[PDB]
Every structure is written in structure tokens, then in C-alpha cells.
């Protein structure tokens, strides 16, 4: 029991320190953009789990008995249920926010908090000391399966579906970095919380604990640490793809055709190079990196057509001079839209 108490105290201290440091850094930097809000709320939920769950776990085991009225037990159990709901629900909210961000280049947090508050309501009736009541056929089975479905099964399945959609759309890079951070967070949450739910289901359906308790208590400190290691701004303070590839290929083809044009000797070579230019410009204008994009590619095609006309007239040097404006248009728009890879 002494070892259990010491381990719980160490975990509580580590979680409190990590979450406090992360919240302090976030507040000092934000003194208001996405990622910051969701991560701050996740850290607040981890702090709620530490304070309202781990501390009662220490306080009951200090004397091996509960000291307080029935309402005290009701409130503490309700708040523990709220926090354990909120962890997964706000991870899901972060994943959905990332999906929204990658779809198109805080309400969800409040929705997750409301879900956590309202889905823990029966905890004000089960415990009444606070010897928990039971149903006539079985009391633990129904609520245990309910908790498994609502905390672990459905949120993890939804996050997996959202991640599948996100990897679809990304592969169809700050956004990629944030997606990877969210994926690591959900993987850590699953790894930390799966054995606890599995053993609670086995205890329900099959009529020791401290090791799984410590393993499930490790997520509340791992999440802020991995976020800090995966975020550049916080680290400093503490101290789609296929279309882009097609655009890059079309732009390099345009550059090669420009090089051919500048070294061309007769009108036939200029005409062939400009034909390849027009094909590449049309193919790139097809791809989605949009009104300015299409307008710039219309300008490019118009310049290519003008150079083609000049080459048809036999004015090779004038055609090359006109096609030199393609470099200016490229530096104006193609490079600007290629700099969007930094977002990705």
C-alpha cells in the first residue's frame, strides 16, 4: 500500500507539473488560433483527471476508507466520469477540427464538455458512505458495457474513421505535422486506456489492479509532453498531395520548354516547345492547388498563344522575347502557389 501511494503521488506530481508548464506557456504566448485552444482544453481535462480522480484515489487509500458524506462520493465519482469522458471526446473534437482544417484551407470543445457532463449523470444515483447500488439481474454488467461503448468503443471508432478520411484527403506541411501529432495523441490514449477497459469488461463478464491503474494514469502526462515535443512554438517558449505533385511536374515541364525556347534556332522548335507549354499549362490548370490560380494560368496560356502566333509569323526572336514574359508570370504566381507547400 505504501508503494501504491508513493507511485500515485509521483504520477500526480508529474502530471500537475507538466500540465501547469504547458498551460503557462500557452497562456503566455496567447496573451488565439486553433490547435492552441484544443491543446489547452486537453491539458485542462488532464488536470481535471489528475485533481478529481487521482487525488481521491490517494485520499481513500490513505486510510483505506472514505471520509465524507454520500454527496461527496457522488460528486467525486461524477467528476471522474466527466474527466474520463472529456479526454476521449476532446481528442475526437481535435481530430474533427483537423479534418475540417484539411478539408477547407470553440463550439466543438463546448459540445465535448456537454457530452462529458451529461453522460456521467447517473453517477449521482449509483453511489449512496457511498456503497454503489446494483441492478436486479446485474448492476455492473450494464453500466460497464455502457461505459465501454461510450468512452472507448465509439470515440475510438469515430477517430479512426476521421483519421482515415484525413489520410485520404492529405494524400489525394504544418497541417501534416498537426495531423501526425493528433494521431500520436490518439495512439497514446488507446495504448494507455485499453487494458483498463478490457479488465473492467472481464470483471463484468467473468464473475493486479494497481499496475493497470498506473498504466492508465500515464496518458495524462504523456499527452502534454508529446505535444510540447511536437510543437515548435511551445518548444521555443518553454526554453492534396497528388495535385501538388502534378503541378510540380507541369511547372518543371514548362521550365524545360522555356529552356528549349531560349536555345531554339528556328520557328518549328519554338512552335513545338510552345505546344508542350500549352499542354502542360492546361494540365496544371486542371489541378487544384482558385480564381486567382485559374486567372494566372489563363494569362500563361494567353502568352503561350501569343508566342505561338509570333512563331507562326516566322518572328522567332520576337516570339522568344514574348515568351520571356512567361518567366515573369511564373515568378509572380507559380512560385507563390508552390510556397503553399509550407502549409500542406
Amino acid at each position, epitope marked *: 500500500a505504501r508503494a501504491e501511494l508513493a507511485l500515485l503521488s509521483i504520477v500526480f506530481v508529474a502530471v500537475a507539473l507538466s500540465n501547469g508548464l504547458v498551460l503557462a506557456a500557452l497562456a503566455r504566448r496567447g496573451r488565439w488560433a486553433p490547435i492552441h485552444v484544443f491543446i489547452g482544453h486537453l491539458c485542462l481535462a488532464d488536470l481535471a483527471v489528475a485533481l478529481f480522480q487521482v487525488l481521491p484515489q490517494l485520499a481513500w487509500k490513505a486510510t483505506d476508507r472514505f471520509r465524507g458524506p454520500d454527496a461527496l462520493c457522488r460528486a467525486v465519482k461524477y467528476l471522474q466520469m466527466v474527466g474520463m469522458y472529456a479526454s476521449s471526446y476532446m481528442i475526437l473534437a481535435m481530430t474533427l477540427d483537423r479534418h475540417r482544417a484539411i478539408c477547407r484551407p470553440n463550439r466543438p470543445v463546448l459540445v465535448a464538455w456537454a457530452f462529458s457532463l451529461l453522460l456521467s449523470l447517473p453517477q449521482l444515483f449509483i453511489f449512496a458512505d457511498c456503497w454503489a447500488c446494483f441492478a436486479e439481474p446485474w448492476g455492473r454488467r450494464t453500466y460497464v458495457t455502457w461505459i465501454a461503448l461510450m468512452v472507448f468503443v465509439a470515440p475510438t471508432l469515430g477517430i479512426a474513421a476521421c483519421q482515415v478520411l484525413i489520410f485520404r484527403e492529405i494524400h489525394a506541411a504544418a497541417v501534416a505535422k498537426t495531423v501526425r501529432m493528433t494521431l500520436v495523441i490518439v495512439v497514446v490514449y488507446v495504448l494507455c486506456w485499453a487494458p483498463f477497459f478490457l479488465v473492467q469488461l472481464w470483471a463484468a463478464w467473468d464473475p493486479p489492479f494497481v499496475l493497470l491503474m498506473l498504466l492508465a494514469s500515464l496518458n495524462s502526462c504523456t499527452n502534454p509532453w508529446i505535444y510540447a515535443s511536437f510543437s515548435s512554438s511551445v518548444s521555443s517558449e518553454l526554453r492534396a498531395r497528388r495535385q501538388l505533385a502534378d503541378l510540380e511536374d507541369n511547372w518543371e515541364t514548362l521550365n524545360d520548354n522555356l529552356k528549349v525556347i531560349e536555345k531554339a534556332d528556328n520557328a518549328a522548335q519554338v512552335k513545338d516547345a510552345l505546344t508542350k507549354m500549352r*499542354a502542360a499549362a492546361l494540365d496544371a490548370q486542371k489541378a487544384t492547388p482558385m480564381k486567382d490560380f485559374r486567372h494566372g494560368f*489563363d494569362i500563361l*496560356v*494567353g502568352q503561350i*498563344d501569343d508566342a505561338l*502566333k509570333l512563331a507562326n509569323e516566322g518572328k522567332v526572336k520576337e516570339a522568344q522575347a514574348a515568351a520571356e514574359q512567361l518567366k515573369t508570370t511564373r515568378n509572380a504566381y507559380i512560385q507563390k502557389y508552390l510556397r503553399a507547400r509550407s502549409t500542406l
Partner: antibody
Amino acid sequence: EVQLVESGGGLVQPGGSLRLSCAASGFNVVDFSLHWVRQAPGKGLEWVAYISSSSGSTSYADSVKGRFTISADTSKNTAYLQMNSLRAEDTAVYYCARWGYWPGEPWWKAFDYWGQGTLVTVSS
Amino acid sequence: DIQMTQSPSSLSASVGDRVTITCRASQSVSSAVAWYQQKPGKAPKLLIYSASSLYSGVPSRFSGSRSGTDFTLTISSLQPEDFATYYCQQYLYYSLVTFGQGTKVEIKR
């Protein structure tokens, strides 16, 4: 509706001259480039020439380069194809098609409207 | 200098069948490929433009598809009016338009 009609087709001796005409009604020639396409009897389609009324740019195919001259007249909304040195391979049917200007959807609609064409036959 | 190679020079099918005509460009012409239908003794009529968009006025039984430099015209249901000649044409530029050899659709017997 808008349409294109053709005239001036007929029978000429080899090495002669003939000016085909293409009257477009319902639309202006300054909005569309006008192309002359040729189909030999029993053979497939073959592009011959094109004229851009607005920019004044014109082009011809290799087989008719130098012998044909295509011009436009926006006063009558007509296109003219003067054909000279007509060899025996020019017996065909000539169609006068329109084509929109870049940019936009009109350019993607290639040869949306045609004319009925005129039969040009050369023989001694 | 860009050749369109319409593979089936002749096709035979009955009413109600699904037929497919394939055309191949020498170079990359993006999606600038059109499909025309010509009956004997009449001017060609535009069926498909931009290699996928059917022209406003033609029935919906005609469709077009692109895969790299391979373009495909598909007629899902044959009709008595469908039997005619079909041409593929690339229109990358005004002075570079080339037509295919054609595909005559006959009646199976």
C-alpha cells in the same frame, strides 16, 4: 438560332482558282475564329485553314500552304477562302466551322457549329 | 505533328448494345479531345467536348473518358439513329487540330 452557310463551290479546271465563301448569321466573326475543314469523297476529315478576325492571325495546313488564302469581312460577317493552283487532290467537300476564343468554356467547345459544306471538284 | 489513332476502323452492333471507341494521341493534349458524329451526306455534329462533357442537345447515352493519352467514347444503348461515323479530334491549338480515321457503326446481322 445562329448558323453558317457556304457558297462558291463548283467545277473548275486543274490549276484554276475559286473563292469559297462562308456567311455566318446570328453571331459576329469578331467573337469566333473561323476554320475551313475539308473531307475528300470516301475519306476522313482534314483541317485546312483558320482565320482569327480580331487579331488578324491566320494559318494553313502543309498541303494547302501558299496555294490558299483565307480572309475575313466583318462588314458582311463572311469568311473567304481563295484557292489557287487546285491540284487533282482538292476534290472534296469544304465545311466552315467556328471556334471560341480563349479563355473560358467557348474555347473548349471545339467546332460546336458547322456549315453544310460545298463540293469543290477539279477535272479537265 | 500530333496523330490521333482511332483504333476500330469498323464496328458492328445491334440495337441496345454498349459500344466503345478508343482513340490515342501521339503527344499529351491534356483533355482537349472532341468526338463528332457524321451521318452520310451531312455535316458532322459535335457529341463530346473536353473529352468528358457531352454537348448540350445530344442524348445522354454518349459518354467520354480520358486515361493519360487514351480517350474513349461509350454508347450505353444503341439506337437506330446512332448508326453513323464517329471521329476523334485533338484541338490543342488553332493550327494543330487533327482528326482521326473514323469509325463506322453498322447493324449486326
